[PDB]
Amino acid sequence: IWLKVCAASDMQPGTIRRVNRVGAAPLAVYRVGDQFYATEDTCTHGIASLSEGTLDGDVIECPFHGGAFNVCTGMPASSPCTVPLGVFEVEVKEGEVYVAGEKK
Amino acid sequence: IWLKVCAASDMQPGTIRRVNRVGAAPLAVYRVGDQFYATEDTCTHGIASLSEGTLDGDVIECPFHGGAFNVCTGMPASSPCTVPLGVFEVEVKEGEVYVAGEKK
Amino acid sequence: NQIWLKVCAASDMQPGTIRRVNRVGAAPLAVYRVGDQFYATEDTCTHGIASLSEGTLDGDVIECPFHGGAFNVCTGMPASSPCTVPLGVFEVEVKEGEVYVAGEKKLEHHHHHH
Amino acid sequence: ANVDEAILKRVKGWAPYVDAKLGFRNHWYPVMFSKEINEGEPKTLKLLGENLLVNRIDGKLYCLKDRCLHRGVQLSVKVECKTKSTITCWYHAWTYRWEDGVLCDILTNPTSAQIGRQKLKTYPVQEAKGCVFIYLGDGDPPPLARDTPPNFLDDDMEILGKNQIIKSNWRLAVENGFDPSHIYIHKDSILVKDNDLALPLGFAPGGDRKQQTRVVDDDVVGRKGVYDLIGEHGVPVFEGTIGGEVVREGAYGEKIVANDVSIWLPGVLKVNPFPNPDMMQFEWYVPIDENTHYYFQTLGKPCANDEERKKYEQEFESKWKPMALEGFNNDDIWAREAMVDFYADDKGWVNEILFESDEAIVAWRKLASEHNQGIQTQAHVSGLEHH
Amino acid sequence: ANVDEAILKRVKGWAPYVDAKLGFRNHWYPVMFSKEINEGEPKTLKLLGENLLVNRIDGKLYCLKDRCLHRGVQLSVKVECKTKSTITCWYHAWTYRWEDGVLCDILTNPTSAQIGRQKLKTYPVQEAKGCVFIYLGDGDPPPLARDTPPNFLDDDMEILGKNQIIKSNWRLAVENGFDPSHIYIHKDSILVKDNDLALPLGFAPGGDRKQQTRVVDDDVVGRKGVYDLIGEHGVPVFEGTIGGEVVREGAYGEKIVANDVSIWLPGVLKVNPFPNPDMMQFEWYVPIDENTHYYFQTLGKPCANDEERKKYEQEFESKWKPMALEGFNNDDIWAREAMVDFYADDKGWVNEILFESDEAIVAWRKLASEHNQGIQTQAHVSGLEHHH
Amino acid sequence: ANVDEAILKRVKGWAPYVDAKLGFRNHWYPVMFSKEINEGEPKTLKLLGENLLVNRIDGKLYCLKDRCLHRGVQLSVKVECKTKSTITCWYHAWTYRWEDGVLCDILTNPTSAQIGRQKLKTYPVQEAKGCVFIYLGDGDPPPLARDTPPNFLDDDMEILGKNQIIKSNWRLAVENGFDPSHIYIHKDSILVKDNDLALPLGFAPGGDRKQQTRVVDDDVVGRKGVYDLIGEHGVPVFEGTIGGEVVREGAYGEKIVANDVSIWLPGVLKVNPFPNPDMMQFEWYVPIDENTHYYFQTLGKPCANDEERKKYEQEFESKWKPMALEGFNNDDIWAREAMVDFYADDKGWVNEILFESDEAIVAWRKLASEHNQGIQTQAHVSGLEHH
Ligand SMILES: c1ccc2c(c1)[nH]c1ccccc12
Ligand SMILES: c1ccc2c(c1)[nH]c1ccccc12
Ligand code: FES
């Protein structure tokens, strides 16, 4: 169920934050403007950390091979990525960032 | 020695009209602005029908390989064409277009 | 020979032009007029056997007509490949509106330190 | 994509066909005969520029791309099938299921996050008439019937054949086979004399342009092809003359063959009847890469019982195969190879000077351009790209 | 610019490495063994795409570019050393000094103004441990130690080896060598049984990414490299399973080898200990051109005198070379060749799908991209170009 | 252009020459000896990248491009000369006349509209001194004398020679031949000792640049060439030294040869006298394709009667051919091959470091750039292109 990630102001616009989860695969929380999104942190094309990539609009570019994903739908935006990223809806209440426990 | 093609008004400038002749090779009637011209319909470089090509000014481009001819002189304008096209006499009278039975 | 070699009247050369100076028993020189200043170097390109006086002068850089190599006429240093060997530079002075070029090239001898 | 855009721009009637140097994607293609692949013995081959692996497990055929997802090596360099349903890469042991290509295990790291999250490309494979067909395409395949000539799949049709690799682009092969006037190169074939065939040197066309061919835009199964009708109103040429003097004659045999000749997408010719009044020939020109193709020949004959089939197989091995498939078609092989240079730089597609009988070829090029199911690109081979 | 810029732009973490198809300039590289080059007997070789000539004069080695300055022919087509300190091109007789490459004479024209005004490219050369190293770079060379792995130069370390030309780009060779999981290809090597080795099939990593390796850039001699510490927190794999069933096991020998593996610039691997608990293996993957490399293998074992040295040599010839260098590493050869096609069009650098053990390789790619001393280009081979 | 514009922009003195990788069009070139082509036996060859066919009919030679207008196959794959004056393509039987290349018949369709309306490229052919010359150009050809060195066509000059294919661009061959200092590579030639020749190792230039050569552009025959006059003011090098010590000596034979050397467009050298004081050598470096050329060698010696011709022919076979053409010129062959890599990427034309004796080569490059009759391009090979 929902996990408290951080205060909205803890992230500058256009930045990415990695969220480690004990016993689980890490997640990546993106701040596009004033909006927040989250996906699995590991690129589906390899072992790269998307949180160490480049964000352009709502598209995250993997730092390894240039593959890319739409941080909202999790669908590939650029090759060689073909496997859709797991998306996690995020909630922002009272200046606090929350990311769902499961996908969807 | 003249065959009825059509009424000058039935042809928009920059358009082509194929003239089939019983027991003989077809001809192509071109309307360049206010004047009409005629040549063999078959491209000399192969078996293409020039009436299915594109007219740019007074130059007809063959749909097969891009070869071209000047519809007034019948001379090649673009490679791979090299053999001159047979030109036929065109005559407008009482608003109707007429093409000569034999080439000039 | 002679310490200073008489070339021509400073007025006989237009800005951006080059003149070849032949010498008895020695290799030819090339004198360039950059604006109102005069410079000189060996005439033979260091990359081959071309005559730099037959090249094109662009500012203070002379381009060889053979392979496109180039040099800075002031320092004699290569400015464009395939040239890699520096040109010998010869001092030029104007006495009485007359152009004079040195008979011996300048050396890294008794001058500013590095 | 595959050809200089300045060239494609010039070819307005069939640019896609000229662009299709690697073949048409999303079509079925025969690549070998059923007897060539046995239980648990993976076989390699290249189709449309792609390296593939075919295996037979519990009688059924499966096809996997012969390129490991990890470092791109061909799994076939050192085959390692450690369980009946899988194949393990010899390099770092990534293991894939033949069934769906899923990466089910990694022996060098059983805890890898990649397990179950990657999939090696697989292609549908179907056996019919003793022939192995592969659907080199994406998504659910259409019926095999769509990509085969009429009657090839008939219940009583007995199919026997031969396959080999030929050094020419597949299109040169298709055009040569469907070329009405190429029959001239067969004038001295042993089959003509030894099987008493009637064979003209060519044809003097008759009727209009549209009467020269019959295009089939749709069949009951979605077939796309063209029939050569030059002989419908054309005059068979039996004596060749130069300056009015006879210098060559056709063959005046009694057997009339090649009643109808049709070419079908993705590139298979049907000659009926041939090489004998009671048989028919179906041959594919399968693209392997830009310079080579599989010349997959088959001869079919209706057979009711097992006795006739036996007899037919005997006749095939002792007569038809050596006298027809080789004695007749061997000349087609070097004829195809002779056109390689002119088209190799793609300039031949602009400089060729066609004549009347080529109407058949033009009809094929247009049909192919308008109804093919996709152009194979080098990107499909190395990995699709989109930024 | 050796690779399509579109591809390089995609590889944010190690573009320089992907661009270094011809190797890194300004580094020392071993190209042959001392005993292979004799007095006054010029030897030809290609290094980083450059044709070179090496010669021994009065015992000392000299290296000249094997390409006459005049019409660009290789002097080696017809070698002409008319004096001990020079070589004369067989074409128009331009003559160069081995010591500095200066065009000192021209037999066809002694009055030529070119004489003394041209210089053929020379490269520093030094022999160490019986190996010939050439500094393929410009300016004064750095200490050899910088481009050699630790202990290779130790006083007592006796070095023996083998060298050959392999048909694959040098990087594929480097990565195959430093690859923790490739060990799987060696499961049936005769060395494993014949030398009673303990050898797993692979590794299940443990701990974070940073812990997977140790990036060294604080070495005092200046060497730059990466240590593979996968077996530090990872569970070695001895039972290979498919669907949970054991289909293959590793080797349960008594000898413990390869406790630590490290890769160092310009591209030399160190496996310690190997192939025996009291030995070390040092191997270079030297770039010859874009498609080939020298697989320079060396085995080191401390020796206190000429008696032990002789003993070791005999063991090397009868056992180590055939059983290890060949019996073990022969599989690495075809493994390298198998990756050629995927990477040949440079597309593999984008399409490869990596997994956990590749973290070590990634670290190497980044280290190499950041600490290499220069990227060799085709222009270096034909002649550097520059427009004012 | 056949070369990167960036390179051509750099070579202001002879860019056309650097661009002429395929040779100069509109010049006569020798390709074989008359005795090699018999009546009614077509021979194939490639000249300036073009595949050609040469045939002898009633003693006269004719040349047709070896590429059918239809599908671009080489007619020579299977030669079918059905009447004395024609050749019929083996594919669809398009038939051409040797004399004018006109498409006169088509056996596969005698009613085709292409008949009498298409023409295959023909090239002028002329035999002289027992040598076969082909005018690889368009329009009526100029006199053969224009493209031959002085004295080659002399009535009493008996011409004997040899021809072969060498793996190097024609220009590298030309420059090797006209190179004054390359003489060094011949110092150990058997001709030097066996024919007691006087042969220096090189030359110490003398006089100004203009005096180094004699450019010929005033020849009444139209010949365009350059004479190498380095020995007129220079001091022959017979003692080569290093550090002031003699390390090699030239040949001090009694026979004086090669005191007159000249290079002529399209690319033929004349060495006089050579290999003997009473003979002359004329050799062509004929472009076949960008990587190869015919090394057409000929030796000329005046002969007033058959007895003298026979005598000459005997010594040619026994001495001149084996001792000179082969014994002396063989080193030139691998010398040419040795320069291929440096110029292969066209960068050698920029990075070469020339010295004094190369002034002769520079004169030739400028002469060739200024007086060639045309630059052959790949477009001439595939088919001229223009919008
Ligand atoms: C891991 C474990 C052993 C080795 C290795 C990586 N790379 C190697 C190269 C040569 C010999 C042994 C090894
Ligand atoms: C100088 C001296 C002799 C020759 C030459 C240049 N070029 C030649 C070409 C063929 C045979 C001899 C020579
Ligand atoms: S690991 Fe992300 S694009 Fe390859």
Ligand code: FES
């Ligand atoms: S058929 Fe018209 S250009 Fe070819």
Ligand code: FES
């Ligand atoms: S001679 Fe001046 S650039 Fe070469």
Ligand code: FES
């Ligand atoms: S390349 Fe196949 S598992 Fe690594």
Ligand code: FES
């Ligand atoms: S190529 Fe070496 S001296 Fe001329």
Ligand code: FES
């Ligand atoms: S290719 Fe020659 S007649 Fe068809």
Ligand SMILES: [Fe+2]
């Ligand atoms: Fe056929």
Ligand SMILES: [Fe+2]
């Ligand atoms: Fe290994």
Ligand SMILES: [Fe+2]
């Ligand atoms: Fe020579």
